[PDB]
Amino acid sequence: KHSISDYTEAEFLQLVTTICNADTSSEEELVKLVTHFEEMTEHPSGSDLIYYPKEGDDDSPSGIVNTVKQWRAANGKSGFKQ
Amino acid sequence: MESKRNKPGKATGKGKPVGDKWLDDAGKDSGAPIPDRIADKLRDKEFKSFDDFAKAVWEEVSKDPELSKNLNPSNKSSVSKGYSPFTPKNQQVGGRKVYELHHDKPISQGGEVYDMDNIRVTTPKRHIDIHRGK
């Protein structure tokens, strides 16, 4: 939970799906997950990746993971575990 | 003092006609009003607290095809649970990332808690701008 490279891609996809599905017990818990997502990706779009995607970006869970993955690849940042 | 917002009460008021981009308005002026069709669904119903009322508001949003249609699929899942939708990143303030319901006339100066004509939907950023100018 410390850094994105602590998650496997399959773990991160589960996390992203939880968020997209609002699969939490409370709004507070969802906002916490969203904050962690933003901290993990370090992407400057923040929560907009999930909620306010650019035109023609895939905002499915796997779509979001791929956008994150490629952006970090493009910006020389570490990838997923494993 | 006992908190009125923490006590049950009965929703009243009319709200106003809004369009399918109503939430874009939450970021400017005095925020967006409660949609009249939301008011129509909630008026005369009793709620346990202002938080209970706000949940009912977001549930009614998710059930109204016109008011929920601008929401993306993830924001739609959120409102379906009765959570407030996430605002654009540029409208968030720290840990405040969802639309907020605020009272236009303050309760301490006689504003009513569940008077839906006394409630505005704001982004966290817009609420803070308004508050800082008081």
Swiss-Prot record, chain A:
Query: What protein am I looking at?
Result: Colicin-E9 immunity protein
Q: Which gene encodes it?
A: imm
Q: Does the keyword Glycoprotein apply?
A: no
Cellular component aspect of the GO annotation: protein-containing complex
Q: Which GO terms describe its biological process?
A: bacteriocin immunity
Tell me yes or no: is Heme among this UniProt entry's keywords. Answer: no
Q: Which UniProt keywords apply?
A: Bacteriocin immunity, Plasmid
Q: Name one GO molecular function term.
A: toxic substance binding
A Pfam family assignment: Colicin_Pyocin
**What family is this?**
Belongs to the colicins ColE2/ColE8/ColE9 and pyocins S1/S2 family.
Function description: This protein is able to protect a cell, which harbors the plasmid ColE9 encoding colicin E9, against colicin E9, it binds specifically to the DNase-type colicin and inhibits its bactericidal activity.
From Swiss-Prot, chain B:
Could you tell me where the Low complexity compositional bias lies? Answer: 68-81
GO biological-process terms attached to the record: defense response to bacterium; killing of cells of another organism
- Per the record, GO CC terms? extrachromosomal circular DNA; protein-containing complex
- Keywords on this record? Antibiotic, Antimicrobial, Bacteriocin, Endonuclease, Hydrolase, Metal-binding, Nuclease, Plasmid, Zinc
Coiled coil (residue ranges): none
Binding residues for Zn(2+), per the UniProt record? Answer: H102, H127, H131
Q: Which regions are flagged for Basic and acidic residues bias?
A: 17-28
Q: Which GO terms describe its molecular function?
A: endonuclease activity; metal ion binding; protein domain specific binding
Which cysteines are cross-linked by disulfides? none
Annotated region (Disordered), positions in chain: 62-94
According to its UniProt entry, the function of this protein is described as: This plasmid-coded bactericidal protein is an endonuclease active on both single- and double-stranded DNA but with undefined specificity.
Q: So what family is this one in?
A: Belongs to the colicin/pyosin nuclease family.
Protein name, per record: Colicin-E9
Query: Could you tell me which species this protein originates from?
Result: Escherichia coli
